[PDB]
């Protein structure tokens, strides 16, 4: 009769507001402003940087990437407790009438 | 379980061990998706821009 | 001569704006609006009801 959902997975999503931020070798990780939301999915990794990138020291820098994670299709996992649910059962006697 | 226009009857421990970005069933204003890293990927082919 | 900061740490902090949220047994997990922000610190645990 009355279920209550416990966990909503999602199926199809999209990523908007995509942005990235990098920082020079050996002087720390980058810091992006919208890493603070838990909407934006984050990933730190290391790019190669040097004078052509405009930093110096010729090493492997750090980089971060964020994009806002919205949703389009969900599923709902509804659950019940073994009360408040009924079974409908039919009891037809014999000695059949027409059709 | 209840997808777009169908529905099934799945095991509970199977349903909780299911890798997709989820959200609690009481979470109104569903912005904080939790394991979002199972529906994104991060392309760093060379050692350049990802 | 010219330094550049690597990592700032936090010697001393204060906590304000405590909001809690607790839900029924065998019905999922709690969920609160300020868990989306990452200034707030969070922990899930088990009360009996």
């Amino acid at each position, epitope marked *: 009769k*009355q279920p*209550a*959902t416990l966990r909503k997975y999602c199926i199809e999503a999209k990523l908007t507001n995509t942005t990235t931020d990098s920082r020079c070798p050996t002087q720390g990780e980058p810091s992006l402003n919208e890493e603070q939301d838990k909407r934006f999915v984050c990933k730190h990794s290391m790019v190669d940087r040097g004078w052509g990138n405009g930093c110096g020291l010729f090493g492997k820098g750090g980089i971060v990437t964020c994009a806002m994670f919205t949703c389009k299709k969900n599923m709902k996992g509804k659950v019940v407790q073994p009360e408040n649910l009924e079974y409908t059962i039919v009891i037809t006697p014999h000695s059949g009438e027409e059709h | 379980l209840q997808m777009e226009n169908k529905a099934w009857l799945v095991h509970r421990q199977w349903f909780l061990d299911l890798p997709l970005p989820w959200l609690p*069933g*009481a979470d*109104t204003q569903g912005s904080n998706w939790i394991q979002k890293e199972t529906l994104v990927t991060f392309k760093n082919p060379h050692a350049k821009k990802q | 001569k010219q330094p550049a900061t690597l990592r700032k740490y936090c010697i001393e902090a204060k906590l304000t704006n405590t*909001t*809690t*949220d*607790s*839900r*029924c047994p065998t*019905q999922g997990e*709690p969920s*609160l609006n300020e868990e989306q922000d990452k200034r707030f610190v969070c922990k899930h645990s088990m009360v009996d009801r």
Partner: antibody
Amino acid sequence: EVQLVESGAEVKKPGASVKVSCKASGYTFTSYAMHWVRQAPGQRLEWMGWINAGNGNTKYSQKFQDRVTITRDTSASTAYMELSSLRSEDTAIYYCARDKVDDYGDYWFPTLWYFDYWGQGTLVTVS
Amino acid sequence: SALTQPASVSGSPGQSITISCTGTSSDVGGFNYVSWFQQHPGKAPKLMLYDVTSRPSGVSSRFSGSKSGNTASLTISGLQAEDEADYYCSSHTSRGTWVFGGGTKLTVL
């Protein structure tokens, strides 16, 4: 035999701070919380209150958490509202409300009964 | 984020009518906290029902109610003339706060 009397403010212009008082009598004041609700004439009941104890904690409403503050004194057995920054739409009757704190002093979960015993209702206006 | 009980309701004396109110899974949908308050207009509001279906001492057994998930009800069996006051619902969220419904003023004729 439980009586909770109040005191009425006459007329407060917009901008001035207003405070009301309830004199909780008939029970141990330090082991019961003190809630505050309001009612404009012909409208709903919305919940202004906080969660008193012998501790003196608070839990304000989300609508105007940055508007109200408290004080109390168990030696006088009275709980005090403090509504500053009065506005034009804030003409309402302010009711008193009690419920019981836990046996451990704190107010974590409310009792199943909320407001068995009530107050009078304090009317404010604007001009 | 208030509850959704209707504007008003009518009943002849002797009837058994109902007053409904809906909400969300934090207000009514999980918790057994729903209360009702009768409020005569020159009077402080007086509570009619405890947690879902219980009842204070002094309140007659005419008043009853139930819950159906997100929706709670109040059935007055045997309407008399002294039920001419609006009934405000109540709840307690998972968040920690308190909400009340809109109010159903009940006429008896």
